[PDB]
Design a protein around this ligand. Structure first.
Ligand SMILES: Nc1ncnc2c1ncn2[C@@H]1O[C@H](COP(=O)(O)OP(=O)(O)O)[C@@H](O)[C@H]1O
Ligand SMILES: [Mg+2]
Ligand SMILES: [Mg+2]
Ligand SMILES: [Mg+2]
Length: 1289
């Protein structure tokens, strides 16, 4: 390896492995050909750069070299052709770097100051000009994050030490107002004239020049983003002063319905009442996991990341989720995220070779990415955060819209060039932590989390975000430790770090407590020593929280952080005086010195004096429309179409509390209308999340669009067992182009429509929300000015306590004798304006849907709740995009059956009856219950809306009649494949196209029987019960490393089998607080230890191997004659890297990147095979589904000799099977490409078993996405843990 001087350090260059699989190489070559770049071949290798602060001895050097060996064993090639090295841009540090460096440090290599990675491309193209070489280089890197170099040694530029930049004053005293004008422009403060006035007067009064940092801080605190001027403005509309702000109209819903609300408008989440259940976690003193019976109340929040996602969509969406997760954990005095939701709105995809007939290219700003790039990289970013942090993503929306329409301001381009990127979720919180505590004078003021870097301050580099989810998981564990101390929780006050960085968050924190603060700049953790005080204080670096703790709790807080490996710094003290001081020990000066009332003082309230514009719609021109062609087009609208590309990329099982995910039934079809989690691992109480949104309707009727968003949230949630509608609480997220003609009045009318009218009438609170007020994009296209302006876009998220998660209905049709009933809350209006139908024929139409009758909407909800509780429904699916046609089609997909329905009672206009998007939906009931159900509906005033349609039938026919006429008839399989083509095409361009194609094609085989089970044992027989009945409970070491996230449910699985589950962190073993000699059983848990950097599980394993003491400890345990060990997912990966310590493991494979090249969150069919594994005794020959959630689960052997030997030794314990029951390598039945379906192996003695899937996530029947109806509480997988208990005796 290379090793050269690098300032006061030395940089080593270490060659890595091949970086690109053959499909990615072929895609690059095909792109060069399409651009007329004659490239003969391309080969890529990873290259690692280690900046060292002191030398490595031979043993250390071998360790570093070994740390940097990871990844799929693709064949090396001797470099040939022109080198183009792609790295992060100078002045940035990749998250890869942060994590790789942490691993080196935890392996004892303190001489490593920083590791960084690039990709060396070797391009053979003898014919190319210097300009064409620049186009080659452009294809190989992301201009917003990366640079291209011509030498490996050029990477020294990434590690240049810069001296701290000093504070700069702005010379108000020496130049007058012009100094502020100049600084406003130079620093991009975006200050209004009255803010310049305010600043001039404040600093004139103080008799000194403002520092840049003080002006920047002020400017971020007074931005529209941060201060919500529009939502607090006075209004005049059509010449009449209005009596309430938009914010006051939202709060009206709380004044009317305070019921069940614990916290609203006083934190960065709302809180509502949950249920008393067993909160499961490890005691501070014992380290033992136990149930704590108490209220688990429910917090909720929804954020957006719309501007950053237009610029750099991966980190935009990633930090959209990451920032919202911090909002959750900083609720109260600390709380715990539980599940997420995700939303996207973008312009037309225009997928190459799959262009749809409504799509027209209208151009876009050069500086933003395309709609397709947002939907490619954005979902991956959001999922990278949710997967690596560890929260399941269980509901969402995805809308495409881009059209030239005759809307409120006449004919113009309306769409989402600036996208909606929405991220939200629910969490749980203890009752005594909901209220923020007092900040005592003298409280210590702390930053918990990541380093600062210069983030948030080519073209828009300031909008390129950066995510490190594992850092935030580390912080969440500290927060967890704190709230888990109950009355001894040392957090007095916590707040997330977001917009404005420390410059907003710390002043907010002290101000919220009625205190001031004094801070020391040089106590803040920084990874960029060149940064100015402005950059340090104001940057928008991620994964940070601020909190206040009493001085006497610092030793406790320090112990908590050190055990989790969460960085923290004490950076100031709360003061009685309401002043803000920031001192700098390096420069011996005071960058900030301000009264808080100056700093947080307000310019006057805004007044918006505006006028109504109302579009007259145009009647839908039906010339080119037929029912058959409409069905085909609508199924091809991404808004309607199957969403799998957004769903399987994100974990849906972490925590073991997910009851209802998006995928429904044996055929795992993503049509669930809402998410449901259990409240704990010991209850059937739970929580539900749904979304309603209908932006295109706002192009015709602003208030109708907002009413439908509320209505649809309710219809999506309605077949979940909740009870009182007042239990349902809403987030309202308002996206608008404020100032665009007609939008401001429209916004006011829409907020009034829901806040003053519909939600109070229904009994719905809106206790949380946000606004994003610049939803438009302008650019120069020809000679012409162009603009793309969003509709007003309200997104409602609904959240509710659930009474019994077991009673949730889905769209999965039964074929027992049945009746299908439409509940048409449209009352026969059958509107077609602003529908999917209209959109797919390039039109807006005339009049949209709306809430037609408030009492009947409420009646619908209550009738559904009565039917759910009485168990009278077989299925439910609501009507939304694509109308009744799509509702029925999606039900037939989920039921893998046909329908025979007649629509003669829905009007003479069959098109309008089928494609209107009025509220309501289809219930399925048992035929014998039809009359009673209809009487029930009639009791709620719905008789007029209720219509018998027909029945679900076995087979493949989707038939719509009207008397004796066939209106539409098609193969259900044909429809289901058309509906899949969008996700097919997205998967195909994003992932391994062979996998995309296999997944797509399997949908066309109607004989697929779906997931099905065969059991070799009695699922209900607790073989551990006689042991448990003795009260003797063996310990299990529940092993976790930093970034592990699946340890709680693992503990709970062993607990149910009779173990005392002990939390054992790798820090515990390294510090002597735990020794494995005291245990007879050990389990290595799932997650993303070190973010999987350096190969999943490798940093964890090598941290053990390279500490001789801990290594010996593991080796001793494994060589004992009676010990048992299990490794699941990340723990399986980890243990596969410890073969040298594990007897009988010599034939084990490696686990590497899935063949799909994508994270796979699947509910996959496996079979238990004959092997020595003691943990699978009694289960051989069983077939049943299991939770899969991994990106590096593919079994990789050295050669066929190794595969054959492993197989002949008989050590394979689980294999993927297809639904026909055969061992398979076809995707996604086998989700990762593992040869012979292998996904678990054991040792020769059967005492150690490792597996990729997660039995601990699905030990509870209620947590199985699909399962046989007759199962009880226990799934088949409970047997693994019971086997471990019995084996111990
Ligand atoms: N952006 C997304 N991320 C994750 N899941 C999503 C996303 N968009 C849609 N889904 C899910 O895919 C399924 C279909 O979504 P959609 O047809 O928009 O729902 P609906 O029409 O019931 O409102 C639902 O289970 C939904 O939660
Ligand atoms: Mg839908
Ligand atoms: Mg729905
Ligand atoms: Mg929807």
């Amino acid at each position: 390896s290379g090793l050269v001087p690098r300032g006061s350090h030395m940089m080593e260059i270490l060659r890595g492995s091949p970086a690109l699989s053959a499909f990615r190489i072929n895609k690059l070559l095909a792109r060069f050909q399409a651009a007329n770049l004659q490239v003969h071949n391309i080969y890529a290798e990873y290259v690692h750069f280690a900046d060292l602060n002191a030398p490595l001895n031979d043993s250390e050097q071998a360790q570093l070299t070994r740390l940097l060996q990871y990844g799929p064993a693709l064949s090396s090639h001797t470099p040939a052709g022109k080198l183009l090295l792609v790295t992060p841009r100078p002045g940035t540090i990749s998250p890869w770097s942060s994590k790789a460096t942490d691993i080196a440090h935890n392996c004892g290599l303190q001489q490593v100051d920083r590791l960084e990675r690039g990709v060396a491309y070797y391009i053979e193209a003898s014919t190319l000009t210097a300009e064409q070489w620049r186009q080659v280089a452009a294809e190989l890197h992301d201009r917003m994050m990366e640079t291209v170099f011509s030498s490996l040694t050029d990477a020294e530029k990434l590690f240049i030490h810069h001296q701290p930049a000093p504070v700069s004053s702005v010379d108000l005293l020496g130049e007058g107002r012009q100094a502020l004008i100049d600084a406003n422009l130079r620093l991009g403060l975006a200050l209004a004239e009255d803010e310049i006035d305010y600043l001039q007067e404040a600093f004139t009064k103080l008799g000194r020049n403002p520092n840049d940092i003080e002006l920047y801080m002020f400017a971020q605190a007074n931005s529209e983003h941060c201060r919500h001027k529009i939502f607090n403005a006075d209004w005049i509309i059509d010449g009449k002063p209005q009596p309430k702000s938009l914010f006051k109209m939202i709060k009206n819903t709380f004044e009317t319905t305070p019921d069940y609300v614990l916290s609203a408008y006083k934190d960065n989440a709302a809180v509502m009442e949950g249920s008393a259940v067993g909160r499961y976690f490890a005691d501070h003193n014992t380290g033992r996991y136990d149930f704590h019976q108490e209220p688990a109340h429910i917090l909720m929040k929804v954020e957006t990341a719309n501007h950053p996602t237009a610029i750099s969509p991966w980190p935009g969406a990633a930090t959209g989720s990451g920032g919202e997760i911090r909002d959750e954990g900083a609720t109260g005095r600390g709380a715990k995220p539980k599940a997420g939701l995700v939303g996207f709105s973008v312009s037309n995809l225009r997928i190459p070779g799959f262009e749809q007939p409504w799509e027209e290219d209208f151009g876009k700003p050069e500086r933003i990415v395309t709609a397709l790039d947002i939907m490619t990289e954005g979902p991956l970013g959001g999922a990278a955060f949710n997967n690596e942090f560890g929260r399941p993503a269980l509901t969402g929306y995805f809308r495409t819209y881009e059209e030239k329409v005759n809307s409120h301001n006449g004919e113009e381009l309306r769409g989402y060039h600036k996208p909606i990127m929405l991220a939200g979720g629910i969490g749980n919180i203890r009752a005594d932590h909901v209220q923020k505590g007092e900040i005592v004078v003298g409280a210590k003021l702390i930053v918990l989390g990541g380093p600062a870097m210069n983030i948030g301050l080519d073209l828009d580099f300031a909008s390129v975000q950066r995510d490190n989810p594992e850092m935030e998981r580390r912080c969440q564990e500290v927060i967890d430790r704190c709230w888990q101390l109950g009355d001894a929780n040392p957090i007095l006050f916590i707040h997330d770090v977001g917009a404005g960085g420390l410059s907003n968050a710390m002043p907010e924190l002290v101000s919220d407590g009625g205190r001031g603060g004094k801070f020391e700049l040089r106590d803040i953790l920084s990874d960029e020593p060149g940064m100015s005080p402005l950059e340090i204080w104001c940057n928008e670096s991620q994964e940070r929280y601020v909190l206040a703790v009493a001085a006497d709790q610092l030793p406790l807080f320090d112990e908590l952080c050190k055990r989790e490996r969460a960085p923290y710094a004490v950076i100031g003290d709360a003061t009685e005086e309401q002043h803000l001081s920031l001192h700098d020990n390096h420069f011996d000066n005071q960058p900030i010195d301000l009264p808080l009332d100056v700093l947080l003082g307000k310019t006057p309230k805004m007044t918006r004096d505006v006028q109504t514009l109302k579009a007259k719609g145009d009647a839908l021109n039906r010339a080119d429309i037929t029912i058959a062609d409409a069905v085909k087009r609508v199924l091809h609208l991404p808004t309607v179409a199957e969403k799998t590309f957004l769903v399987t990329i994100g974990d849906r099982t972490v925590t073991g509390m997910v009851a209802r995910d998006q995928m429904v039934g044996p055929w795992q079809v993503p049509v669930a209308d809402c998410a449901v989690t259990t409240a704990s691992l010991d209850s059937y109480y739970g929580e539900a999340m749904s979304i309603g949104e209908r932006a295109p309707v706002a192009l015709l009727d602003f208030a109708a669009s907002a009413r439908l968003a509320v209505g649809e949230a309710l219809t999506n949630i309605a077949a979940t067992q909740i009870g009182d509608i007042k239990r349902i609480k809403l987030s309202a997220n308002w996206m608008a182009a404020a100032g665009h003609p007609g939008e401001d009045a429209g916004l006011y009318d829409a907020v009034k429509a829901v806040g003053e009218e519909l939600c109070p009438q229904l009994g719905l609170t809106i206790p949380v929300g946000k606004d994003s007020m610049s939803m438009k994009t302008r650019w120069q296209e020809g000679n012409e000015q162009r603009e793309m302006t969003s509709p007003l876009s309200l997104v409602i998220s609904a959240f509710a306590r659930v009474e019994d998660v077991r009673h949730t209905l889905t769209p999965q049709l039964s074929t027992e004798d049945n009746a299908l009933l439409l509940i048409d809350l449209g009352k026969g209006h059958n509107a077609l304006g602003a529908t999917a139908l209209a959109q797919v024929y390039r039109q807006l139409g005339d009049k949209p849907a709306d809430v037609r009758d408030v009492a009947q909407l409420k009646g619908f909800y209550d009738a559904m709740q009565a039917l759910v509780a009485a168990r009278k429904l077989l299925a439910w699916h609501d009507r939304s995009d694509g109308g009744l046609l799509v509702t029925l089609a999606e039900m037939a997909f989920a039921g893998h059956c046909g329908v025979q329905v007649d629509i003669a009672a829905l009007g003479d206009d069959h098109l309008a009856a089928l494609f209107n998007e009025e509220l309501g939906g289809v219930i399925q009931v048992r035929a014998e219950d039809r009359d009673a159900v209809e009487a029930l509906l009639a009791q709620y005033g719905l008789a007029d809306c209720v219509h018998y349609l027909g029945q679900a039938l076995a087979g493949d026919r989707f038939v719509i009649t009207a008397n004796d006429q066939t209106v539409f008839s098609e193969s259900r399989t044909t429809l289901r494949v058309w509906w899949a083509e969008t996700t097919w095409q997205m998967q195909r361009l994003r992932d391994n196209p062979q996998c995309a194609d296999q997944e797509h094609e399997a949908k066309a085989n109607d004989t697929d029987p779906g997931l099905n089970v065969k059991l070799s044992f009695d699922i209900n027989e607790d073989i551990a019960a006689p042991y448990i009945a003795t009260g003797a409970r063996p310990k299990v070491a529940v092993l976790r490393e930093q970034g592990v996230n699946s340890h709680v449910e693992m503990a709970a699985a062993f607990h149910r089998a009779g173990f005392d589950a002990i939390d054992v962190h790798m820090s515990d073993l390294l510090g002597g607080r735990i020794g494995l000699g005291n245990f007879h059983a050990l389990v290595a848990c799932g997650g993303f230890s070190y973010g999987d950097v350096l190969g999943a599980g490798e940093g964890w394993a090598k941290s053990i191997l390279f500490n001789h003491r801990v290594r010996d400890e593991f080796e001793t345990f494994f060589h004992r004659p009676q010990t048992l060990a299990l490794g699941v997912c990340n723990g399986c990966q980890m243990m596969s890297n410890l073969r040298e310590l594990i007897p009988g493991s010599e034939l084990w494979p490696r686990f590497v990147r899935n063949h799909s090249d994508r994270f796979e969150a699947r509910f996959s069919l496996v079979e238990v095979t004959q092997s020595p594994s003691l943990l699978l005794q009694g289960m051989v020959g069983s077939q049943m589904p299991i939770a899969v959630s991994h990106g590096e689960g593919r079994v990789e052997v050295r050669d066929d000799a190794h595969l054959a030997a492993l197989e002949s030794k008989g050590l394979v314990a689980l294999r993927y099977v297809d639904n026909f029951g055969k061992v398979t390598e076809t995707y996604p039945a086998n989700p990762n490409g593992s040869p012979n379906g292998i996904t678990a192996v054991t040792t020769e003695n059967g005492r150690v078993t490792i597996m990729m899937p997660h039995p601990e996530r699905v030990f509870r029947t209620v947590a199985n996405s699909w399962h046989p109806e007759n199962w009880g509480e226990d799934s088949p997988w409970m047997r693994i843990f019971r086997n471990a208990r019995k084996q111990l005796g």
